From Swiss-Prot, chain F:
It comes from the Viruses. Changing T90K: In strain: Isolate SZ3. Changing F32S: In strain: Isolate Shanghai LY. Attaches the virion to the cell membrane by interacting with host receptor, initiating the infection. Binding to human ACE2 and CLEC4M/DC-SIGNR receptors and internalization of the virus into the endosomes of the host cell induces conformational changes in the S glycoprotein. Proteolysis by cathepsin CTSL may unmask the fusion peptide of S2 and activate membrane fusion within endosomes. The gene is S. Disulfide bonds join C107-C117, C152-C177. It comes from Severe acute respiratory syndrome coronavirus. This is Spike protein S1. Glycans are attached at N9, N66, N98, N147, N159. Changing N66K: In strain: Isolate SZ3.
Amino acid sequence: LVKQLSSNFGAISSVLNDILSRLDPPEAEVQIDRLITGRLQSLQTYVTQ
Amino acid sequence: HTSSMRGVYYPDEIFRSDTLYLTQDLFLPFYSNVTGFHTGNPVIPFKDGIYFAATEKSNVVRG
Amino acid sequence: PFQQFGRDVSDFTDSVRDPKTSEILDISPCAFGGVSVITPGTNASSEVA
Amino acid sequence: PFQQFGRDVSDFTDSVRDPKTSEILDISPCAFGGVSVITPGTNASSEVA
Amino acid sequence: TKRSFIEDLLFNKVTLADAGFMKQYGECLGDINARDLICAQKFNGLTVL
Amino acid sequence: TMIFDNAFNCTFEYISDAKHLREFVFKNKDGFLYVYKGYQPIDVVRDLPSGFNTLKPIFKLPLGINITNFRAILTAFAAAYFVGYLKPTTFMLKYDENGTITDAVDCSQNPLAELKCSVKSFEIDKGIYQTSNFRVVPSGDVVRFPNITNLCPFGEVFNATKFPSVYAWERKKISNC
C-alpha cells in the first residue's frame, strides 16, 4: 500500500506539488484526477484484502 | 442578541417527504452574534449575508 | 405554493405541479425488472415458462 | 557532506540540512488523524466528548 | 513481569514486528505506566490502533 | 425622498401592489437576490424571542447587481435592527409531515451536532462513532537558502585608504557578484 502511492497512474509524476508548477490548471485537473482514481483503486483493493 | 435557532429557510423549491436532507447552501448558523440597533438610527452595515428581523408592530422597518 | 416540483429520498424527481392548469401530482415509476426463464430440462421436454 | 536531503522508508523526504548555516535536521510530521465523538446517548443526556 | 516463563518465551520469540518495516506506519508505541508514551506518525497517513 | 432624487439611468421597473415579528434574509449568489419572509406572534420586547420560524421565499429578482450595503430605515418614530451576518456552513433539515421543517441541526457549533449530521439521525445511541478528520493549519513559514556564494567586494570600494580627486575620479568594474 505504501509503494503503490508512488505510482504514475497515467500522469506526469507521482509526486504532488510537482505537476502544479509546470502545467496549466485545466490540464492539472486531469493530471490530479488520474492520480486520485489510481490511489482510490489501490486503496479499495487494500480494503478488500 | 443571539440567533438561537433562527434563520432556517428553504434552500430550494424541492418538496421532500419524511427524510433527513443535508443542505450545504443554507446559512445563518445557530447561536450567532447579531448587532441590534435598538434605539432606529440610519447605519450602513456590511453585506454578503444578513438576518433582517423586526420586532416592532405596524411595520416600522419597511425599507 | 412556492414549491414547483419535488424529489424523493433517492434524489430523483418524484412529483411536479402542472404548468398549464390543475396542479396535481405527477410521474410514478414504470414496470421493469429482470425476466427469468423456468425450464424443466431440455432432455425432458421443450416447454418454457 | 555530499548528502543534501534525506528520505524515509516510505519514499518521503525526512530531513535536509540548513542551506544558510548551522546544518541540522529538518521537518517531522505533524499531528493528524480521525476525530471521534463520544456520546452517552441523546435520550440520556446532551453531553459530548 | 506479570507473565509466566512460557508466556515470556512466546512474547520474546515471535515478537519480531518485521524489523526494518516497523516504521512504515504511525503508532504511539509505549505504555502510560512507563511515563514515556512516545507518539510517532508518518506522512503516508497509515496508523495502527 | 431618496426615490425622487435622480433618474439618470433607470431599468427593471417592477411594482408589486395589492406584537409582530417579520424576519427577512437576503442572499446574493451569481447575481440573484433571494428574499425570504416569516412571521411569528411574539410578546416580549427585550430581544429576538426563541423559536424556529421557518422562512418562506417571496421574491427572487436577480437584478444583476452586487449589493454591498443597506440603509435608509423609516423615521418619525420601538425600532431595532437585529441584523446578523452569516457564514457558509452545512445544515441537516428535518422534513416532517405536510412538507414542514420545524427542526434543523447546525453542524458547526458542537461535536454532537456534527455527529448527528454525519449519521443522519436526531437521536444518537451510545458509543464511539468516527465522524471526520482533524488537521493542523500551519501558522508561520520558514524560508532558507544558501546565504552567499560570491560575496561582493563592496568593503574594498567603501573602506579604502584614499580616494582620488574630482577631476581625476576613477570608476570601478564590479560585476558577477
